[model samples]
Target chain A: QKRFYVSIDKIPEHVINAFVATEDRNFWHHFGIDPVAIVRAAIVNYRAGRIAQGGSTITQQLAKNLFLTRERTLERKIKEALLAIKIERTFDKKKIMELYLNQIYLGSGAYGVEAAAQVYFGKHVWELSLDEAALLAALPKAPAKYNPFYHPERALQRRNLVLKRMLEEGYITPEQYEEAVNK
Target chain B: QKRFYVSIDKIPEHVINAFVATEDRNFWHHFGIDPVAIVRAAIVNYRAGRIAQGGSTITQQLAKNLFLTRERTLERKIKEALLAIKIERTFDKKKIMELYLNQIYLGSGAYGVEAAAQVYFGKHVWELSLDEAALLAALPKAPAKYNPFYHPERALQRRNLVLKRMLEEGYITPEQYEEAVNK
Candidate 1:
């Protein structure tokens, strides 16, 4: 509780913008991660030979956040599921987002949106640019490889891709898309 | 066999030298991936609050060489182990090293030591110097972050750290350790 310090408003707008595009379009409607998405990721990783096992429903991630130790054992994963169901029984969607966004790891050692925004852009949490938000959202997938400051072209590509996905998902209108996409 | 090709002898002694020193001091003695080392990584990643998966041996990595996916699932891991142990059963150490050297994804799009040597150092494989070798050897811990060319100071620190660890582990002679430290 003491280590937990970010406020709801302090949550980066870009990160919220990102989760919608990358994690789920209807995350607000769902309890957490989509089951269909999990099977899909599994199948995709299976076909690729060595690329399966990335199925973190927002719920699973939330469960891990509240009660698990980030251990990679199947036992931790089981506990993650049980905690998600409990959290779902107690808290509503907005409260869940308030906690989840505040708790998630956005890479580069930044714990939440506010910290990540400050570290990466040297700005107030509320001050992130759309591109900066897009970059943070895309980072969890491959933080070290796709860091814009580190790999500009790849980061650009990933940011634009997230924007395109967001547009397709209708999170942003065409105009919003136009403003975000440089490629 | 077609897309996978690494002549250990042709891989430039500097690369082989540094990689062997850092990645697997007992690589020649063991098969793919050091399980003890991977468990250590798991514990560290867990504590760091980062993604806690990907416990592959070098042989599992060679499976990616024969294919091209970097997902971390049980199935993919099984495939890697099956292929690696088979390769071990069929071929000698040099042959295994040859496959591994040629098949590793050395960050960016660079594949294999032959391509990576030229990309990282701007020199042919054989042209790499002792210092450059140490730099490359320090890379795979977290390639993009510790990229010597990108973060020279951090890369230097990691290089020194690797050198110290290797020396403490008795992978190199005192004179060789002194040479690397001075170099």
Candidate 2:
């Protein structure tokens, strides 16, 4: 269950930054995992009586992508945690995040941000706009449930949640969010 | 009537020599037309009671190939002769031969040695063997009557006839002639 992974060049750069900026703003500052999201998700999952929330970092996602199938067994979960630590130890923050963005399953059967951009917007990864970038950044959490092209209202709500989080963390101003949303 | 036309690259070396050796022995040394062959043809035609023979050199053939249609009229013959002088002034021996090969009707709707080689032999002109080479070489005089693969005995007879002319002109040895005939 414990597995190995490596990030190589050719992963779309804008994709890595977009996913990290929107999902885990302090991803590079974390250890192997984001402890805050982990604890928060643990409480949410326990309350929900299932493994609902994924308080996983890019490294943990990469570990899941590489080693585990979608069984969601306890052994697989332990294996993913161990491999996440190993991947983080071996790779730098940029490299680990790159592997996660490329490997993690995004919405509509897309496994990479570049593919998601192409599928959703019919544009190259480099050509993705700030608004389009933010929408893609939110897709990995629940691709089908929050896919903008399919579930527009749900996707807009999810985009607002990300905007609130980004504003709260002082990554963007409220005025900037308003301009992006309105424009 | 007077014209010099050639795509030198389209013709192969072997077809050039084949036509040259068969039709004109001193093709490179001569002017527009071989005076000796023309006089000889004139006498032969006189004897035959019609226009039968043309001791056309490779240069004269190139002139006809480029300028004249295959009408076989007196005007076409005059045109071929008139054009041969102009063509002779323009093209060298090699160029004239290349033009002739490309322009000459090899009697099977083949305008060039290349077309003939591919159409008749199912191969490139360069890949033709000595027997196939001699067979194609013999066809220029009476193409339909002496096409070796089409009419075996007449073609073989003319092939030996060509071999004899080539041997008499010192282009091939007596031994080479014998071997060519045996095949």
Candidate 3:
């Protein structure tokens, strides 16, 4: 498979916003780690009696995917945080976001947003609509569970949730939200 | 999106047989072009009022994917036949099959059999069952329409049809067919 790497400039603003709004709202403001988000996720996971919420920033996820193993342990978390800080110091935010967008696995053999767009909608990343962008953004959490091909209802719900978050974050207007949801 | 290329040696015999049985039973005997098969498909397409069946051997498909543009015309068909013969002269049967297996697109983001297995089943190609192999064999005709993720019933029907062909071609026993169909 040819991996089509879309540059940050080529990626649409709304597509980036969909990911930023849903995955990490404070992405721009935060240095590397967010203690507040960690605590919030900890409370949620504790109540759920499982590791339901991973409070990993995009940087942390990039570190883990690039350099670390898949073991979910305290040591791994510590390493992830440290590596994320190092990554933040090494690269600009745009570079970091570009790496994250291109490297993250979106499922069904799709390693990035570009591939996900082609896999799910048979379109290029730049051609993706707001709803389609939201749908792609919703997959990073649980791709198999939210796959539009097999689990369209679950995918739709998550897509709407992403759209709602985008609306709340002022990334999209109410009209955009309504239109995307209807679509 | 990393492309995993499985060598012909690494591919299971049954998987190869499934493709040969369904796509081109005369794959071993034909020298890149099968006039008999082409005439048969011409008859079918003429009756159907559309280009329903492609008379391309695996070699012809490999030639088109590797070098030719996707314009369906008499000139292109002539070029495809010439290129396939050249490829047959350049490579052995095993090599041709290997190239075909690794180059053909199989829907979603999968470019080959290995990636298709990972995309559809989340398993390595070596781990694919007979039915799974048959399902993959069914995709080359129309990948989007027979995609197991979006159209399981259609995929199943084509998969079973492939298995029946395999059985008729003595690639699998009746008992094996029963077991695979049940699965």
Candidate 4:
């Protein structure tokens, strides 16, 4: 249960990009909540007839994990939004990103990006390759289902999706995307 | 977070048999430990170069979940074995089954069979159909990975596997097996 926390400076740019692109594309732009993403997620979940997608930003996720329970309710959402805006006002973007990266659970008992890198690839966070970084990015949605150790094929597809998102977001070049996908 | 505990008698015979057949075929024969299953699991894990399969009996699983951390180690295993034997000595098979059924975590924030029944199928434990019971039986191994709500295909395959085990163990007739599978 020893978590290895890596500083934002230590984490590579592509690694951060992978998470931001796949998890919250408007991480830098959003104050605390993203109305556009929320509407999008509402439509998807409404169609699915269940909460298949969460439109929470990284700040809201951090707020929930840090201070709130896992109950999905209107009251909890209001509390989460309030706490998230407070966090945004209290900390810089890099500090928030650092906290989010270190606090997110990446499954297999791994508690952060560094621990996840070591657990899945036996490499340090700074040593993770592009595909490996993307694989780690793919886990926060549903860790057990996309666990690379347990379901390599699902992990591969999800990782590739992360890379694709990064490409679409212009975080990585086409060449870099192809190289990561091929890996 | 409120849990619903059902008595062993209230639980249907097929539900008990589904878990016993797939999780521990020798639940009645074993004295809290099965040396044969240990060897079988050892080979499987060794071949996979990971702890792919746990050969622990229902008694051992109950002991670990109730009193131990989720660590897989020699010391933990020894403690689990000791506690399982102690549990077996103190309780009858029915009580043990009831305890395990009501204590096991089946993901989706649901603990125990009754909670899982309500969460997944919106039914009471005793009201579960044959296939629904088997689907609940399939979740103890990897609940998030094979969750019916999230991954219906994986859940179906794992549920059918549980039914197959039940049929092979003579817990269900071929006719019942066919009916459940078609459902």
Candidate 5:
């Protein structure tokens, strides 16, 4: 319901990596449209008989947020891809990432990293600790379920998972990872 | 496998009308994408408890033929819609209709109006009779199952329905419809 926009430059590098590592593993290596990821998710979802997961990249999510409705039809998904391609052509990776972070809904009436940080911890995004940053990053997938104020234990678990991912993806050192996990 | 291309100018006005009446009623009014048709088909298919129907417009089919694989996944279906929209933007309705008539597979290994006309009735597309044109138009939904040689009853029923559509859509006179049905 409320949002505070901020530049990607001000956001911590690890915060961005936390999302990319968990959400889209090939964020840098891919165009906005990732056919292989799409097919792979489709096959997996078909076998599971539901939308158990998603394979949308950051740019695709931004495209959907900016241009598409929330309908889960093939038509909406296709437009997302088209918009994603146009976005990739029009903006660089950092710009897309910035737009995604600032536009994505992150639960409890918050939209974007600054609002999420303020709502969850009463601090600016830049002032948050690693664990706090990871917690905010984890909220997008299931914002309400991962709400720190209401579901602190689940939020902590998700934050640690993000920290694990960040460390595995070489975005954080072992010492930083230990400090975040212990803190 | 083998196909015979027929230009739009060579294809009969009646044949094209039959297809438009039966396949996509909104072909001339909207772009390649028809959200109403898609949603209507979705509700119908959902009630039928399976994907027993399709909402693809002629242009969408042409897009599938041109740029997408026949994988039957959500991803492929999405790309088909995107390509359909792009095709509509790039080509006029007449051009899209022309491309579709020449590219769509009309069962029994026949591709395009010429090949289907020859295979089914041993005549050129422009020379096919009204009943024969209806039969050709009806084959795209299920070509092998509705083959005239093997399933004459089903084919005849489908053809009559196409004729009925043409009449209802004012593409044919009542007398012509009667003659086609009687034939």
Candidate 6:
């Protein structure tokens, strides 16, 4: 958080599960772009009559981070999609997710899981609690709004949502969700 | 613009001359990006206290045409620069210019020199007169304002500017410029 997060040889399972369940549930399935997900998002955006949500996957976010300027526009989105496809073709899924985990911003001047863990709880990414892992994963969506230091309630709610997603995805059990919530 | 144009095998020399002279005088000189032109434009823009004009080369414009949405934004410009460099690496200079002549917008529901010639002068690109070619080349900067069919005076002035540039760049002889201007 203060400077740079040290590289990790092994990523914790909890962190991976939390990030996948919340950020991109089908991260391991698609080749950069998930056509079905994009269609679903389009339908949802159409029904809402406004851009209520984005359909970008983890690969797309990483593409934007690496090659593009952060501007919410169709041109930028197209470039992101193209770059995502190129990245997916060049790197394997695990490598892409690992880069994403280390490259993503998680608020409070924190970049990556390890940085967020240090800034929020004074712990390593591998040593985080279940709720803490979920909290870190939740911040990537809207880091400034979900930073636990400033908005604890919103952070908790977001963390709960991530935990629920993990439970639904069978990454965690009901007991795990309950114990994490209680903590 | 009204209908999409089909690709052509060969481009007209006059059309190429007009485009190279007016849009990117250094189309065949630099490696996609013209650093000297950029530095000059930076100084001019800095003095003007705003983006007074753009210095996008033919390669950059073709990059925007082929791989990007037609949007005016800093992100789009950055992508254009990157894509231009990549395009220069991928294709030869003649191919780039060929693509530009056939891919760029030449106003009045026209997407290429052929389409523009048909729209404005009711002729094919290769069949165009020197003045017609110059007029088509001038429209990419401000299509609506310099549309020859509707805005003859403005179009003539813009066309004459292209002829002058063509003369300055030695793309046309003084007599050729005189003949085109009289037309």
Winning candidate number (lDDT): 4
Worst 10 residues of 3 chain A by lDDT: A62-71
Query: Model 6 chain A: which ten-residue window has the lowest total lDDT?
Result: A1-10
Best by TM-score: 6
- Indicate the DockQ of the complex predicted as candidate 4: 0.01
Model 1, stretches more than 4 Å misplaced? A1-4, A9-14, A42-53, B1-183
lDDT of 4 at A59: 91
Which of the two candidates, 1 or 2, achieves a greater lDDT against the reference?
2
Give the least accurate 10-residue stretch of model 1 chain A, judged by summed lDDT: A1-10
List TM-score (chain A only) for every prediction: 0.80, 0.79, 0.92, 0.92, 0.88, 0.91
lDDT tens digits, residue span A1-183, model 5: 323666677998777888887777677778787777778788888788965457888877765664323576888788678667755654457766775787678888888888888887899878878888788778888888988878988988988998998889888899999999887
Estimate, for each residue in A1-183, the C-alpha lDDT of model 6 and write its tens digit: 224433335568888989998878899999899887777778888699955556789999876765423477887788779867755654457767866787688888777787788889998888887888888888998988987888998998989999999999999989999999777
Candidate lDDT values, in order? 0.64, 0.65, 0.82, 0.83, 0.78, 0.78
lDDT of 2 at A131: 61
- Scored against the true structure, residue A43 in model 5 reaches a CA lDDT of 82
Please identify which of the two predictions, 1 or 3, would achieve the higher TM-score against the true structure.
3
Mind giving the per-residue lDDT tens digits that candidate 6 earns over B1-183? 324332334566887889888888888889888887787778888789866546889888866664323577887788779867755654457656755676577776677777777778788777888888899888988899987778989999989999999999998999999999999
Docking quality (DockQ) for each candidate: 0.01, 0.01, 0.01, 0.01, 0.01, 0.02
Clash pairs (backbone) in predicted model 1: A32-A59, A33-A57, A33-A58, A50-B71, A51-B71, B32-B59, B33-B57, B33-B58
Q: How far is candidate 4 from the true structure (C-alpha RMSD, Å)?
A: 22.0
Whichever of 4 and 6 has more lDDT, that candidate is: 4
- Please give, as one word, the docking class of candidate 2: incorrect
Each candidate structure's TM-score, on Cα atoms with residue i matched to residue i, is 0.44, 0.43, 0.48, 0.48, 0.49, 0.50
- Residue-by-residue lDDT tens digits, candidate 5, B88-142: 6444577668767876778877878888888888889999888888998898888
What is the C-alpha lDDT profile of model 1 across A88-176, one tens digit per residue?
54345555565566556666677666667776888766787766777777776677788777787888888888888777876677887
RMSD of each predicted structure? 20.6, 29.0, 22.0, 22.0, 16.0, 15.0
Per candidate, native contacts kept equal: 0.00, 0.00, 0.00, 0.00, 0.00, 0.00
> Where does model 6 sit among the CAPRI classes?
incorrect
